[PDB]
Write a protein that binds this ligand. Structure first.
Ligand SMILES: [Mg+2]
Ligand SMILES: [Zn+2]
Ligand SMILES: [Zn+2]
Ligand SMILES: [Zn+2]
Lengths: 107, 187, 84, 97, 1390, 134
RNA sequence: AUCGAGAGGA
DNA sequence: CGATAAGCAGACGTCCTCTCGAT
DNA sequence: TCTGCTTATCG
């Protein structure tokens, strides 16, 4: 995890996938001054594993192409460091049930 | 009780209805947009009204917003390639010297706001200082006459199409410039 | 390509759309004067005959409710619950 | 009388599927066509009364299927065919494999 | 089907697009074309072998298709073809052909970049054919090399291919190009190579992009009839097929001999030109026309275009048989679901009925009556394709009715028809009605069915639509019937309420002076259709038997109905007869108004629809109307002009109010004229004046209006119509008797259309109210001429605003519907779409249909912790906090029992957990929420139908209540899955309802307040469970369409304040708008400190952007060469103050006003250091002190500097920054109210300072210290998508849509807006409802056709060779099939 | 009189209150393509003349048009003419299937190009019915 | 009957 | 020569009832 | 009224 204090060049973000495993996560500092997950509109996202994901994909008859998708640039996808297709559970609170499970795949 | 005003044509009494259009031959100043290079435009639509539709729409624009200091003023011409600077237009007409031009635009030599607003056009036309060259920009040595043709038989035809009057077109363009700059000063 | 009669997850209650399709198919069968399967207490309107057979559940049909993955499950009109 | 798409919306929201097919096929234009099971277009010559069906350009003379569609849809598919687009109509969702 | 065949009726399932291989069309075609002449020199039956004759069919309608030989009706038209030699481009693909050449070098015949290059794996491996192309073509857009990083391949250069007009050539490095070359390099292009471009090896190959031979459509695409028999007839398309051919002949002429420089391409250019325009007229270049004038051309594309084209106009909708239309009129003595059908229309429409033993008698009689006697029949159909025409046939009375025959009988009384009112905004505008044949040519309606159609009886015409099979009349009777639609999913309320005369007279009937005698009461009693026949005992007997309106009205209300409602002043004795109490279907106290019967949420319609059923409520409509209409008939009600005449003292006393308003305005004017107007923050010294004086005049107007309203006696008819809410509002009274007020154009006072005056009867520069559009007179008083003119200006703006916002609204609904359409709850109760992609996992997040939901409260959330303590506490182990033995058979038998207090403390524990959980979500303290079962209406339905003794003990133990409640929650069901995910989802889905359930089914509650018994309690358990299972949605319900409508219908009624409000806001919200007109921040203070105005002013002073340019009076440049001695006479002291211990001599002086330096607290040192910090060491800068009189800043640079100083000043006025945030523009401190928990438990509202800004740069605004970065709100949801993730963007977007809707006093239930917000949110980031927002998806080509771009989508699908599963609506609707929608979701069999 | 509607006095209406005259003036002319063929006004025959309107021609005189004073209702053929082709073919002009009244008068006069051309004015009294807009 | 415009009613 | 950021041309805002002219 | 080709500015 690379905390930079001001900003980087296009040649510095050209080496993020350099090392095959262990991929580096380039974060600004003005972004991490305040916790975005501490804002009310942001729920508690929760990572899950390939086994929990396969349980989702069979206990709902779903292909990956069907999940409500999230992107690698998403701020709370960065916050939890989502890789390709890593699924998250989302506990949303609402006026109808007061608790709702959302599932999101990572594009 | 029938009032008339219609035309019986193959039985039906067809009616000509009144049509609305913006008046020709009047000085209008419209600001172009917020995100544009041109911040002000002086339009005049021109037709002879005895002849049928010598449609000539003259646009005298202004470049740069409130922040930009390159307040260069250009103007468009019928049949021209693109919008040429105004001092080149004046040198094309009877007025060569810079400052005698000013007497056609600014009508009180103690108006330093409007005077100062005009300076960059002189540098846009620094590179031209005689009549023969002013027409020459307009575009093979016949171009000058071509330019003069555009100056006589096309540009600003709502005055005349005789070669004898070019002071009238000059003072009138100066009046247009005065209106444009007077709006740009927020007056 | 199948499902069991056990291990069924869909609602046991009849949907209004299942009810309407059943009553329409039955009333069509009765309009084409096919064999009727109850007694009529002075009821000649074929849709109301369908509704009578519905309240009796002597309409031998099955609903094949389809699942988005190509699966499905069968529910006999004899089996479903009707509270609409 | 027009049955506008603003009305098709309402006839979807209620859930009247068969009424919609009715008021879009039987109470309006409707048409029967012969489709080649290999080509997929309205190529099959339909000379009935002798069970004579054949598809030029595909040699099909046993694998032909009749269908019901609006004549406006037949017209649309024909205009596409004249515009070089081939909206092939296939009778089953399953491919051979 | 018009015959039979040895062929089966298959159904269309999947549709594969593509392109026509020339190799294919040459074989598919039946005949060639030889020459262009459409007609014949002989001009005989044939037209000639050359065009549209040979084995293509013909026109004499007898037996004319050579090929089909089956006539003119069964001939589909067997395509022909030309075999032109020179191939040309297909205009739809022009851009694509440009792009396809970009990826292949011309001499290679293979891709530019191979798999060796690693700048392709991110792009070539997409495997999603036509999405990959967008990136991989930009990859190949500019590579000129085509040959270890160098393998086999050619190495020649290729041009930067450009196109002009209808061809493409470009310079290699200076070059030309041709068309056949393009076709050539695609036959040579490999098989595996174009497959990554988005293509197919057999269905669409780029060699077929170029067309060598085009097909010709059959004659059914070319009609020809004429008024004159002896002339020609031709369709427009044929003209130009013949033009293309005529071009095909020019090329043969230029083939026979040489072709000079012009004849080289001039002929081919025009031939391809005519082929191009065969497909398209408008290319934003050359426009062209047909020989017959009028800019006319085929433009086959324009056949399919939006406005009235094939796809959007002939497939989404059709002219349809069995249809009707006429004017409407309202008939009280019609029942609600009935429709008045004129006799001639029911004499015209036919329903085919099959012969069966029960109808054969009446069918025979109907045939006997025939077409002109009403209960008759137009035709009779035998067991063949033989029709019998009853209106003139020989055997019209000599019929032998065999069984199974069809009789097309006239539309009969009490049948199902579909009634329509255009525009069909929502699905309550297309409802099934029950026929009643009436005379007089006008469709008759019930009164209270105006509202769902939005129709007055002033001419608004309506349509009627008739079924043709048994299944469809069943579908109308059981899905579309009016009583079903009584209570509505949108707004979770009923749409039909008692309206206008019934309602106006209901208030008159239920007053406390309204008394009725026997002679009248008897007729009223017989008027009610379904009643027992028992005279009610007169409420008052004494000197004269009299009746109250509540009494005889409660005969219409069925027994078993109970209703509570409380208003301002409603004690248990209502002295102003306020509120309403109903028990056992009888009125106890109140005046009946719109609140109780006007389609309200908690109203008698919503009560009776759920308790008794739909039929009872639909009949209740008529049962109430038939009494109240009558009582009005014999009592009467009018409205005169004396109803607008208020007292001489009153009318005068409002004029003095306007006079004091005029004094106020004149005084503020004379103030502003003396420069003493201290304009407040962020507002112009002019804007202050405008806003303040408008406030003055609007306050004076409202005061005069409410000074007239107070003077309306209880006789005033306008007041009595407002009182019932029949048709009336406050402002109507104000404008008609007090003062109309102030008109406004473009959200501002009257304009200065004339130079420095408003009208040439006024002086110049008059900013007075009369000169600025205020009307001191009322409609009764009489407007003066100038006032009438200003009112006309305002009204004309109102008219255009209506005529424009309605169009925008309709477009909004179109986009919404076409986006959400086919969002249908699937069988696993999961909101989905055609592809199967989940939108919601649980519909509405609880799986509950919006019809059954109801606004009920949760007593746990509000109230002190001590008042909560008084409830629900059961301390058996305490003498005082236990259930008194007065409430239980075993009250003192279980005092101190340990094993019971275990369960009782467990119950209290989950009650407290519940209270904190609900308080954690609903932080406002609001408990009134939509919940699926009305529990209190069960408790009164048990306190009533079990006859509870309010003094005796109950017969259930604590065990009974507690474990029965805990077992009830185990059987409240939404999902039935067998594994942990679905069980957790079911728990989550019923969480909130279980909270309410325990809130109202607690031991202390049940035994003290409700006083239940065991039998009735078990009944209540079964009843709650059954109502819940009833409230759950049904699979197949299309809530996407319904949600689009539930947003669209309210948007229609949104006619019109510092922000973009209403319909413009909705248009930018839906279009997701990168730039908006009102961006803003709502800035909340520190959690500990929120009421200190000092820190609020500080934060305001640290956020507002401030430019040095905003304080510079003058920026002037001097020559000042020797610093120690300046030239300026008031500056030398400032230079002397540089004594405390090299240049350019070009000075730069700046002068700043002292006002703006104090409006925002500012010192010369701060600005000086900011300038010095900007220019770090490249500008010497000094200044004069703050204590001076003239603020001055002086700068000097550290040859050719006459010009290089001014640009420093320019960057020093623009790119500077003082204390402030970049994009912020202003800020205002305002004290909001905020409900918050007081320590003792009660919710008290606290005030807190909040900052409202202009502009948004939230990314660093929240980081600013001293604020709450857990609360700060930006109205721009698009920035919040980028800052706080997406799951916060969904929420902000719903909040914005909500505030839009609920700004009109409106209410849409959360389901539909949440569904819309989700469906835009699930597709990665924000997706707009536009032609490129959502329709850019991969749903289905035929599905995408129905929306804006049509032939673009069709062409791209033919090129990319898409595959349509036809699992959405529009797909099936195109081919006229039973869409797997609603009734079609499930298959039926044996 | 609900929702912007009203009641009208039938006794007043029967006296003639808000009563109207409505004249629809139909028109035709022959010789569509003169100097080659020529159409002719007449009451046609039912034999070898093809497109015979299913309505009755029996209110037409031998010059092929009605006289003022005749009652007309529904698909009555008001003007009859034929178009010859190689016998005559029907070109008659029926009434509007929606209206009914009485022939007010007939105007026969040649056009600028000399050709038979006719204007037939039909008149109907309209009484205020139950749905008429006011 | 086809096209295209204009005029009104919702 | 791989990004960036200005241009400068691109599109659509339910029914329905008459009449007319000229292909 | 927003977009998706270009085009030249920038490092
Ligand atoms: Mg109306
Ligand atoms: Zn084939
Ligand atoms: Zn044929
Ligand atoms: Zn190459």
């Amino acid at each position: 995890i690379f905390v930079y204090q001001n900003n980087i060049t296009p040649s510095a973000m050209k080496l993020v996938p350099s090392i095959p495993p262990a991929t580096i996560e380039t974060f600004n500092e003005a972004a991490l001054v305040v916790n975005i997950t501490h804002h009310e509109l942001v729920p508690k996202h929760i990572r899950l594993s390939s086994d929990e994901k396969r349980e989702l994909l069979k206990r709902y008859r779903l292909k990956e192409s069907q999940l409500p998708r999230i992107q690698r640039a998403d701020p709370v996808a960065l916050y939890l460091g989502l890789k390709r297709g890593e699924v998250v559970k989302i506990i949303r609170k609402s006026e109808t049930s007061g608790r709702y499970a959302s599932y999101r795949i990572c594009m | 009780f029938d009032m008339g005003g219609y035309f019986i044509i193959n039985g039906s009494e067809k009616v000509l209805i009144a049509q609305e259009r913006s008046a020709g031959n009047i000085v209008q100043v419209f600001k172009k947009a917020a995100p544009s290079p041109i911040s002000h435009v002086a339009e005049i639509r021109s037709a002879l009204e005895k002849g049928s539709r010598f449609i000539s729409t003259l646009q005298v624009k202004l470049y740069g917003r409130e922040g930009s200091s390159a307040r260069t003023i250009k103007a468009t011409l019928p049949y021209i390639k693109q919008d040429i600077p105004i001092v080149i237009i004046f040198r094309a007409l009877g007025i060569i010297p810079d400052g005698e031009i000013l007497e056609h635009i600014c009508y009180d030599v103690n108006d330093w706001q409007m005077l100062e607003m005009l300076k960059p056009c002189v540098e846009d036309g620094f590179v031209i200082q005689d009549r023969e060259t002013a027409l020459d920009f307009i575009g093979k040595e016949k171009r000058i006459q071509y330019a003069k043709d555009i100056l006589q038989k096309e540009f600003l035809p709502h005055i005349t199409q005789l070669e004898g009057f070019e002071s009238r077109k000059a003072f009138f363009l100066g009046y247009m410039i005065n209106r444009l700059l007077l709006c740009a000063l927020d007056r | 390509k199948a499902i069991p009669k056990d291990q069924r997850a869909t609602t046991p209650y009849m949907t209004k759309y299942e009810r309407a399709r059943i009553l329409g198919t039955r009333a069509l069968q009765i309009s084409m004067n096919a064999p009727v399967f109850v007694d009529l207490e002075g009821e000649t309107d074929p849709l109301r005959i369908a509704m009578k057979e519905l309240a009796e559940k002597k309409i031998p049909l099955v609903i094949r409710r389809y699942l988005p993955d190509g699966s499905f499950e069968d529910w006999s009109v004899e089996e479903l619950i009707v509270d609409l | 009388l027009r049955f506008g798409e603003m009305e098709r919306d309402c006839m979807i929201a209620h859930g009247a599927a068969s009424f919609l097919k009715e008021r879009l096929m039987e109470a309006s234009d409707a048409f029967r066509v012969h489709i080649c099971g290999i080509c997929g277009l309205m190529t099959v010559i339909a000379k009935l009364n002798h069970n004579q069906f054949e598809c030029k350009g595909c040699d099909n003379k046993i694998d032909i299927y009749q269908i019901h569609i609006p004549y406006a849809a037949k017209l649309l598919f024909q205009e596409l065919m004249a515009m070089n687009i081939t909206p092939r109509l296939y009778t089953d969702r399953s491919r051979d494999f | 089907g018009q015959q039979y065949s040895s062929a089966p009726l298959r159904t269309v399932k999947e549709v594969q697009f593509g392109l026509f291989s020339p190799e294919e069309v040459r074989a598919i075609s039946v005949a060639k074309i030889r020459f262009p002449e459409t007609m014949d020199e002989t001009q005989t039956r044939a037209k000639i072998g050359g065009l549209n004759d040979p084995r293509l069919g013909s026109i004499d309608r007898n037996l004319k298709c050579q090929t089909c030989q089956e006539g003119m009706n069964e001939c589909p038209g067997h395509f022909g073809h030309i075999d032109l030699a020179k191939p040309v481009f297909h205009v739809g693909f022009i851009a694509k052909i440009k792009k396809v050449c970009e990826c292949v070098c011309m001499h290679c015949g293979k891709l530019l970049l191979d798999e060796h290059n690693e700048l392709m794996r991110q792009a070539l491996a997409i495997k999603d054919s036509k999405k990959r192309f967008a990136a991989i073509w930009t990859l190949c857009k500019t590579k000129m090399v085509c040959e270890l990083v160098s393998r086999g391949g050619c190495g020649n250069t290729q041009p930067t291919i450009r196109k002009d007009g209808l061809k493409l050539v470009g310079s290699w490095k200076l070059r030309v190009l041709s068309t056949e070359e393009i076709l050539n390099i695609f036959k040579h292009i490999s098989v595996k190579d174009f497959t990554s471009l988005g293509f197919n090896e057999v269905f669409s190959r780029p060699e077929w992009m170029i067309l060598t031979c085009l097909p010709v459509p059959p004659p059914p695409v070319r009609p020809s009839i004429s008024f004159n028999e002896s002339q020609r007839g031709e369709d427009d398309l044929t003209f130009k097929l013949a033009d293309i051919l005529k071009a095909n002949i020019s090329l043969e002429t230029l083939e026979h001999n040489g072709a000079p420089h012009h004849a080289i391409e001039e002929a081919e250019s025009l031939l391809q030109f005519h082929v191009a325009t065969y497909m398209d007229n408008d290319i934003a270049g050359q426009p062209q026309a047909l020989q017959k004038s009028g800019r006319p051309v085929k433009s086959i594309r324009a056949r399919l275009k939006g406005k009235e084209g094939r796809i959007r106009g002939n497939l989404m909708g059709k002219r349809v048989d069995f249809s009707a239309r006429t004017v409407i009129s309202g008939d009280p003595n019609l029942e609600l679901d009935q429709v008045g059908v004129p006799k001639s229309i029911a004499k015209t429409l036919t329903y085919p009925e099959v012969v069966t033993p029960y109808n054969i008698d009446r069918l025979t009689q109907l045939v006997r009556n025939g077409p002109n006697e009403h209960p008759g029949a137009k035709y009779v159909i035998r067991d063949s394709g033989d029709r019998i025409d009853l209106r003139y046939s020989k055997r019209a009375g000599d019929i032998q009715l065999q069984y199974g025959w069809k009789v097309e009988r006239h539309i009969m009384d009490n049948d199902p028809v579909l009634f329509n009112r255009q525009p069909s905004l929502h699905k309550m505008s297309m409802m099934a009605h029950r026929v009643k044949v009436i005379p007089y040519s006008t469709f008759r309606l019930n009164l209270s069915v105006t509202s769902p159609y939005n129709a007055d009886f002033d001419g608004d015409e309506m349509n009627l639509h008739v079924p043709q099979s048994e299944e469809t009349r069943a579908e109308l009777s059981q899905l579309c019937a009016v009583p079903l639609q009584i209570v509505s999913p949108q707004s979770n309320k009923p749409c039909m309420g008692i309206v206008q005369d019934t309602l106006c007279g209901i208030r008159k009937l239920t007053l406390r002076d309204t008394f009725i005698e026997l002679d009248q009461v008897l007729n009223m009693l017989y008027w009610v259709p379904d009643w027992d026949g028992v005279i009610p005992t007169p409420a008052i007997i004494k000197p004269k038997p009299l009746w109250s309106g509540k009494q005889i009205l409660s005969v219409a209300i069925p027994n078993g109905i109970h209703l509570q409602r409380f208003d301002e002043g409603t004690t248990l004795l209502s002295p102003k007869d306020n509120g309403m109490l109903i028990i056992d279907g009888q009125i106890i106290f109140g005046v009946v108004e719109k609140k109780t019967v006007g389609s309200s949420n908690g109203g008698l319609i919503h009560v009776v629809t759920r308790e008794k059923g739909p039929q009872v409520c639909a009949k209740l409509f008529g049962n109430i109307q038939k009494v109240v209409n009558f009582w009005l008939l014999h009592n009467g009600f009018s409205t005169g002009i004396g109803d607008t005449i208020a007292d001489g003292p009153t009318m005068r006393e409002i004029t003095e109010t306007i006079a004091e308003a005029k004094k106020k305005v004149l005084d503020v004017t004379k103030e502003a004229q003396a420069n003493l107007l201290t304009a407040k923050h962020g507002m112009t010294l002019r804007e202050s004046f405008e806003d303040n004086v408008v406030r003055f005049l609007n306050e004076a107007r409202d005061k005069a209006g409410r000074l007239a309203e107070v003077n309306l006696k209880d006789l005033n008819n306008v007041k009595q119509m407002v009182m019932a809410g029949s048709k009336g509002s406050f402002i109507n009274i104000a404008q008609m008797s007090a003062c109309v007020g102030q008109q406004s154009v473009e959200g501002k006072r009257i304009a200065f259309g004339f130079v420095d005056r408003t009208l040439p009867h006024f002086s110049k520069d008059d900013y007075s109210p009369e000169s600025k559009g205020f009307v001191e007179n009322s409609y009764l008083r009489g407007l003066t001429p100038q006032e009438f003119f200003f009112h006309a200006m305002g009204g004309r703006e109102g008219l255009i605003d209506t005529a424009v916002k309605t169009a925008e609204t309709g477009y909004i609904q179109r986009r919404l519907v076409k986006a959400l359409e086919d969002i249908m709850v699937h069988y696993d109760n999961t909101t989905r779409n055609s592809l199967g992609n989940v939108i919601q996992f649980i519909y509405g997040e609880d799986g509950m249909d919006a019809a059954h939901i109801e606004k009920q409260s949760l007593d746990t959330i509000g109230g002190s912790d001590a008042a909560f303590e008084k409830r629900y506490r059961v301390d058996l182990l305490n003498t005082d906090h236990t259930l008194d033995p007065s409430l239980l058979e075993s009250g003192s038998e279980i005092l101190g029992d340990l094993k019971l207090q275990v369960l009782l403390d467990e119950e209290y524990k989950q009650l407290v957990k519940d209270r904190k959980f609900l308080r954690e979500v609903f932080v406002d303290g609001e408990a009134n929420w939509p919940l699926p079962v009305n529990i209190r209406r069960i408790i009164q339905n048990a306190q009533q139908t079990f006859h509870i003794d309010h003094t005796k003990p109950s017969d259930l133990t604590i065990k009974d209540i507690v474990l029965g409640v805990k077992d009830l929650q185990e059987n409240l069901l939404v999902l039935r899955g067998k594994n942990e995910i679905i069980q957790n989802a079911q728990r989550d889905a019923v969480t909130l309802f279980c909270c309410l359930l325990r809130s109202r089914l607690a031991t202390r509650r049940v035994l003290q307040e409700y006083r239940l018994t065991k039998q009735a309690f078990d009944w209540v358990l079964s009843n709650i469970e059954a109502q819940f299972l009833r409230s759950v949605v049904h699979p197949g319900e299309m809530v996407g369409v319904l949600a689009a409508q539930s947003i669209g219908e309210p948007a229609t009624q949104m006619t019109l304040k510092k922000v973009t409000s209403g319909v413009p806001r909705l248009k930018e919200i839906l279009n997701v708008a990168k730039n908006m007109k009102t961006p803003s921040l709502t800035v909340y203070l520190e959690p500990g400190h929120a009421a200190d105005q000092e820190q609020a002013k500080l934060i305001r002073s640290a956020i507002e952007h401030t430019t040095l340019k905003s304080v510079t009076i003058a920026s002037e440049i001097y020559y000042d060469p020797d610093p120690r001695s300046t030239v300026i006479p008031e500056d030398e002291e400032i230079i002397q103050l540089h004594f405390s211990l090299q240049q350019s001599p070009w000075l730069l002086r700046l002068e700043l006003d002292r006002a703006a330096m104090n409006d925002k607290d500012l010192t010369m040192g701060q600005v000086g250091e900011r300038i010095k910090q900007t220019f770090k060491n490249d500008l010497f800068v000094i200044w004069s002190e703050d204590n001076d009189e003239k603020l001055i800043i002086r700068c000097r640079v550290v040859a050719e500097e006459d010009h290089m100083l001014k640009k420093i000043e320019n960057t020093m006025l623009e790119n500077i920054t003082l204390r402030g945030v970049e994009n912020i523009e202003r800020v205002v401190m305002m004290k909001y109210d905020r409900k918050v928990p007081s320590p003792t438990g009660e919710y008290v509202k606290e005030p807190e300072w909040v900052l409202e800004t202009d502009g948004v740069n939230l990314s660093e605004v929240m980081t600013v210290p001293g604020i709450d970065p857990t609360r700060i709100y930006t109205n721009s949801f698009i920035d919040i998508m980028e800052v706080l993730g997406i799951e916060a963007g969904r929420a902000a977007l719903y909040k914005e849509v909500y505030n839009v809707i609920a700004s009109d006093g409106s209410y849409v239930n959360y389901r539909h807006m949440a569904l819309l917000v989700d469906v835009m949110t699930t597709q990665g980031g924000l997706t707009s409802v536009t032609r490129h927002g959502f329709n850019r998806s991969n749903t289905g080509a035929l599905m995408r056709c129905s929306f804006e771009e049509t032939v673009e989508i069709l062409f791209e699908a033919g090129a990319s060779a898409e595959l349509d599963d036809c699992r959405g609506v529009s797909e099936n609707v195109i081919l006229g099939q039973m869409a797997p929608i609603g009734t079609g979701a499930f298959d039926v069999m044996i | 009189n609900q929702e912007d509607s009203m009641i009208m006095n039938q006794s007043s209406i029967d006296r003639g209150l808000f009563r109207s005259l409505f004249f629809r003036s139909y028109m035709d002319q022959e010789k569509k393509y003169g100097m080659s063929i020529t159409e002719t006004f007449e009451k046609p025959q039912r034999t070898n003349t093809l497109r015979m309107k299913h309505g009755t021609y029996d209110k037409l005189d031998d010059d092929g048009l009605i006289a003022p004073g005749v009652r007309v209702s529904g698909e009555d053929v008001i003007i009859g003419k034929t178009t010859p082709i190689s016998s005559k073919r029907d070109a008659s002009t029926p009434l509007r299937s929606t209206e009914n009244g009485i022939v007010d008068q007939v105007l026969v006069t040649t056009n600028q190009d000399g050709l038979k051309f006719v204007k037939v004015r039909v008149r109907t009294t309209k009484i205020p019915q139950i749905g008429d807009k006011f």
